[PDB]
Amino acid sequence: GSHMEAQFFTDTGQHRDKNEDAGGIFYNQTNQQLLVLCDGMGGHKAGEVASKFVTDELKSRFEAENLIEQHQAENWLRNNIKDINFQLYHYAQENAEYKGMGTTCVCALVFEKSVVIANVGDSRAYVINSRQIEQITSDHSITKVMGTDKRVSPDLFIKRLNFYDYLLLNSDGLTDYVKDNEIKRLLVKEGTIEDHGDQLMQLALDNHSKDNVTFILAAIE
Ligand SMILES: [Mg+2]
Ligand SMILES: [Mg+2]
Ligand SMILES: [Mg+2]
């Protein structure tokens, strides 16, 4: 399976009690790579329950797969996001402390020359090179989220990566307070993923983000 060097970064921020963001980098039986990021909310402070509900489901479902070829990826992401939305909605309805909770979800199935992205909400996926930064997803924003209705309609995107250097998935705690050009200029410099991720996180904290800040940085070879 195709996989990029990638790392997951999260921080509650200085202005939040809890971290209601979630995410991860998961590998299936043939080492294909799945990037996941979720921004939860709602319920009786149950936002972390919703975002980690979806992240855990995607992890278990993906690790159960042997091979998802690129021509199957759109359908796999769409059907599983729909089923997870169904399960999360009813999990929340059955628990008065959770009722009303929901979460965004942006995720990406990695392939050799492309990535397949599914999105629900206002978390984002970007591609960045030395000269441009393109937001692949469109914010669904009040925000459309998973878990609040028995129906959900995720957007699917296929993006060739050949002429880019970084793939970025992030919660709105980053891009509400850091401009796209600030992100690009930070990434066009030399450095590893860890250091690029730490300066990007410290940059979000320096702009005094009042939200949970979470992102995945993936290097495109
Ligand atoms: Mg949130
Ligand atoms: Mg937002
Ligand atoms: Mg947020």
Side-chain angles (χ1 to χ4, degrees), residues 39 122 139 141 143 172 176 211:
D39 183 349
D122 66 349
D139 289 13
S141 61
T143 299
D172 61 354
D176 286 350
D211 191 11

Side-chain angles (χ1 to χ4, degrees), residues 170-178 180-202:
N170 68 277
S171 69
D172 61 354
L174 175 71
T175 47
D176 286 350
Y177 305 92
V178 186
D180 287 353
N181 290 243
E182 296 178 276
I183 299 173
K184 184 189 77 176
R185 165 172 43 76
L186 191 151
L187 292 183
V188 300
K189 302 322 217 341
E190 262 208 311
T192 60
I193 299 294
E194 241 181 51
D195 295 317
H196 269 116
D198 297 337
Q199 324 161 14
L200 186 61
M201 185 61 77
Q202 291 193 85

Side-chain angles (χ1 to χ4, degrees), residues 16 19-21 38-42 47 51 102-104 171-172 211-212:
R16 291 291 181 107
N19 200 340
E20 301 184 310
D21 288 356
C38 294
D39 183 349
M41 49 73 58
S51 60
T103 182
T104 77
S171 69
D172 61 354
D211 191 11
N212 304 139

Side-chain angles (χ1 to χ4, degrees), residues 61-111 114-159 161-178 180-201:
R61 291 158 186 261
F62 186 64
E63 294 179 356
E65 298 282 345
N66 181 260
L67 173 86
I68 307 172
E69 289 192 299
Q70 179 170 343
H71 77 277
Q72 313 166 270
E74 267 196 20
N75 181 72
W76 192 90
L77 292 168
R78 168 176 300 109
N79 294 345
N80 278 276
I81 289 186
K82 280 174 180 293
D83 191 46
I84 293 170
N85 178 84
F86 168 80
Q87 291 182 350
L88 173 64
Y89 172 78
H90 284 290
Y91 185 56
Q93 292 284 120
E94 290 157 13
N95 297 263
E97 303 301 305
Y98 305 157
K99 192 169 175 172
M101 70 181 177
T103 182
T104 77
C105 179
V106 60
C107 50
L109 277 175
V110 175
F111 299 93
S114 58
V115 69
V116 181
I117 295 168
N119 182 67
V120 180
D122 66 349
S123 306
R124 297 180 171 177
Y126 289 85
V127 284
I128 303 108
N129 59 18
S130 58
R131 309 149 278 107
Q132 70 170 307
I133 168 169
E134 185 186 7
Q135 183 180 327
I136 303 171
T137 58
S138 299
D139 289 13
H140 300 139
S141 61
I142 63 110
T143 299
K144 170 184 172 72
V145 300
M146 291 170 74
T148 52
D149 194 87
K150 59 174 174 293
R151 309 163 181 252
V152 73
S153 288
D155 289 347
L156 272 296
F157 302 100
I158 298 183
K159 183 65 180 180
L161 302 162
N162 301 73
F163 295 141
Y164 297 94
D165 307 320
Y166 282 90
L167 174 70
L168 173 71
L169 276 58
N170 68 277
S171 69
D172 61 354
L174 175 71
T175 47
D176 286 350
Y177 305 92
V178 186
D180 287 353
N181 290 243
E182 296 178 276
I183 299 173
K184 184 189 77 176
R185 165 172 43 76
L186 191 151
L187 292 183
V188 300
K189 302 322 217 341
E190 262 208 311
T192 60
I193 299 294
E194 241 181 51
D195 295 317
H196 269 116
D198 297 337
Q199 324 161 14
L200 186 61
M201 185 61 77

